[PDB]
Design a protein around this ligand. Structure first.
Ligand SMILES: [Ca+2]
Length: 279
């Protein structure tokens, strides 16, 4: 399948070269997979989700996304226009309040929730969790992310936006999950992206168009935006049978575009997520 005049990041993930504008993907499009977006919520009524999104848990007085961040991330995973995996099922877990903040204890509870809740959902092709959040190092937060991965969920986490080594942030620093840095449309490391040995992969993260609350769209930047590209890619590849939740991060790294990014510090991987789709 071909989607013309796609957002640059979608086009990038299906190309060996920067500077193209068509997204190419197998029409299976993540059907039969599920992606949990653990964030500020999802505006499930947005036309772009087509009835494929639902809120399953909140820790606050409402499950609505009063911020926009979670809706944007969900859109990059699985919206019809802006998403990588256009037929996946999206499940929202609201661990962050409408200011984008949350206690680590609530975030941990939300991860353990997903590890159980997947047993209540029909996801025959596999389960992914996208965590566009983080803070300072916490062994408890890292352990929760490790448990979620161990349970059979592909966990993708943002590296963070401090232009620093991600070893000092959680859950970015957990080795067993897939830690995602950000690039721009010219194949440069995004200026804010964290780096370091714990990064596994880069994805598009500067000036990413996606869904927003109030039935709208907007372009924003962050490792938060790169993460859902990788989560959606994992769902897509799992649907195709090419990998499994346990191995998907490794498979994505193995099949990535190698050596194409600039201003990657010595010792950080130079790997850009790529779907390897040949029309
Ligand atoms: Ca890792």
């Amino acid at each position: 399948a071909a989607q013309t005049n796609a957002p640059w990041g979608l086009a990038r993930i299906s190309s060996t070269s920067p500077g193209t504008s068509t997204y190419y993907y197998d029409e299976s499009a993540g059907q039969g997979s599920c992606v949990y977006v653990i964030d500020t919520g999802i505006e499930a009524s947005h036309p772009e989700f087509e009835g494929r999104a639902q809120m399953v848990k909140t820790y606050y007085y409402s499950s609505r996304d009063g911020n926009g961040h979670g809706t944007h991330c969900a859109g990059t995973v699985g919206s019809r226009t802006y998403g990588v995996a256009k037929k996946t099922q999206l499940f929202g877990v609201k661990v962050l309040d409408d200011n984008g903040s949350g206690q680590y204890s609530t975030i941990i509870a939300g991860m353990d929730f997903v590890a159980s809740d997947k047993n209540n959902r029909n996801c025959p092709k596999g389960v992914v969790a996208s965590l566009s959040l983080g803070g300072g190092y916490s062994s408890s937060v890292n352990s929760a992310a490790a448990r979620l991965q161990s349970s059979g969920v592909m966990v993708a986490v943002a590296a963070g936006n401090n232009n620093a080594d991600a070893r000092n942030y959680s859950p970015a620093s957990e080795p067993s999950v897939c830690t995602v840095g950000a690039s721009d449309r010219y194949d440069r490391r995004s200026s804010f992206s964290n780096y370091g040995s714990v990064l596994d992969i880069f994805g598009p993260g500067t000036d990413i168009l996606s869904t927003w609350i109030g039935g709208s769209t907007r372009s924003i930047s962050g490792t938060s935006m790169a993460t859902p590209h990788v989560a959606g890619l994992a769902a897509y590849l799992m649907t195709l049978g090419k990998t499994t939740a346990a191995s998907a991060c490794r498979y994505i790294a193995d099949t990535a575009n190698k050596g194409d990014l600039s201003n990657i510090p010595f010792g950080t991987v130079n790997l850009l997520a790529y779907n390897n789709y040949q029309a």
